[PDB]
Amino acid sequence: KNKLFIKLTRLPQYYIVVEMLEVPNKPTQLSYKYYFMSVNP
């Protein structure tokens, strides 16, 4: 539920989705996951 949708504006229908997750041992670091969504209600 902690994500960020970055829409590209020069070409819409394209999103880069950043998902932030907690690294288990380090409590003061984050881990990022980058996805590439496309979209056509």
| Sites of contact with another protein (CB under 8 A) | 6, 8-11, 14, 16, 18, 32, 34, 36
Please answer whether residues 4 and 15 qualify as being in contact, where contact means their C-beta atoms are separated by less than 8 angstroms.
no
Nearest CB to another protein, comparing residues 9 and 25: 9
Map tokens 């969504």 to a residue: 37
CB of 9 to another protein, least distance (A): 5
Please answer whether residues 38 and 18 qualify as being in contact, where contact means their C-beta atoms are separated by less than 8 angstroms.
no
Q: Using CA atoms, how far apart are residues 34 and 13, in angstroms rounded to an integer?
A: 17
CB of 18 to another protein, least distance (A): 6
CB of 12 to another protein, least distance (A): 9
